[PDB]
């Protein structure tokens, strides 16, 4: 809903309650890199007119959007850290800056693993410069938390994707919700009679 209600953009122009609109551009662009999907991401900025000129004035913000579509991970440890610096110095973002970091990583890791079915972390160290033990525990605590389920081999330098999440799990939500829900109408059916 954040990026959805932020689609007004320049239609509100600048007001005493809207402060600097360029700061509002930084607020809507930070929520757009997550909730707005990659096909829709490039669709809004490219095809957009009034929202495109305001992001072009910021070289650091515009470079991050083009690099996100470019997928190069060498600048992500740099550009996102600069964005994280703004995330630290801005109000109301103090509790929320912890999940935002890795959320853009899995957003970049989503398209990452989709490239090859067999991937080597030595190829990851190229763009990471050089991820070895850092992405080891990183991707380990991802799959453990249910973020981008994948099989990455240790010391064999192999990543396995899969995961075919459109078959087995998509049928599980049927009976999953069908357990607690139907149990509610069970007791509710035991009300009759008395």
């Amino acid at each position: 809903q954040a990026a959805e209600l932020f689609l007004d953009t320049v239609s509100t122009f600048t007001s005493y309650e809207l402060m600097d609109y360029k700061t509002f551009v930084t607020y809507t662009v930070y929520v757009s890199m997550i909730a707005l999907e990659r096909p829709d991401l490039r669709e809004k900025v490219i095809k957009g007119a009034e929202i495109l000129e305001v992001l072009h004035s910021l070289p650091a913000v515009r470079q991050y959007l083009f690099s996100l579509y470019e997928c190069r991970y060498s600048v992500f440890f740099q550009s996102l850290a600069v964005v994280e610096q703004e995330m630290k110095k801005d109000w109301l973002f103090a509790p929320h800056y912890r999940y935002y970091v890795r959320e853009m990583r899995i957003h970049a890791y989503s398209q990452l693993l989709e490239s090859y079915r067999s991937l080597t972390l030595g190829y990851m160290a190229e763009a990471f410069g050089v991820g070895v033990e850092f992405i080891d525990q990183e991707l380990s605590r991802f799959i453990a938390a249910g973020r981008l389920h994948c099989k990455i081999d240790k010391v064999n330098e192999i990543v396995e994707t899969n995961r075919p999440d459109s078959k087995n799990w998509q049928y599980q939500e049927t009976i999953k919700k069908g357990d607690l829900l139907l149990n509610r109408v069970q007791k509710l059916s035991r009300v009759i009679n008395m």
Partner: protein
Amino acid sequence: NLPKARAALTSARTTANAIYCPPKLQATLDMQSGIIHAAEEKDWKTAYSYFYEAFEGYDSIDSPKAITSLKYMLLCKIMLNTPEDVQALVSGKLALRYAGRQTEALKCVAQASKNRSLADFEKALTDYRAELRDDPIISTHLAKLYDNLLEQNLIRVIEPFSRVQIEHISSLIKLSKADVERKLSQMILDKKFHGILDQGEGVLIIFDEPPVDKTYEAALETIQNMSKVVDSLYNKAKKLT
């Protein structure tokens, strides 16, 4: 300075209707709208139409200004490669009105748009290098072209056989791991290319089974079925107590 050019264009917006008659402004204002927006990468075909509307207002003006005006619009036809307005413009009497030297070299440049043909494109690239210098933005014009012509050549060699070895097929594109193979991986992200590679034996295997009519039409309704019960939970709990 693009922001300064937009501020200069914004000043031309209010100045167009300020005085009595432009006399020629909106024709140039639409041309200036076909420059800053061309660098802004807003839209191609519409920006190409601004060069067409400005070319209609270019009638009966200084010829040295109109001889360099076709350098921008005919090279814009090179950038798009699918303007769909080719046959309209170049077949008319206004585009062919210039018989001069430089515009005749642009006549085959407008023909190079109908050409494409990489092997021919790499050749005329040197022959037209004189016209390449007058290109306002040299990077954006030829980069999107050559990058688009890349996958245009990629879909030709991958099409005949399902799976392809990546060592031999990359020898035609002169390199493997640096950029090209990463660009084919980006095509999978954009859905334009369906397939997977193999790093060990170096073979790109194309496999697809997109349609599933059993899973998608079912699970979506079961999730909707939950909304049918949840909306009825208001009836259930309220009638009992």
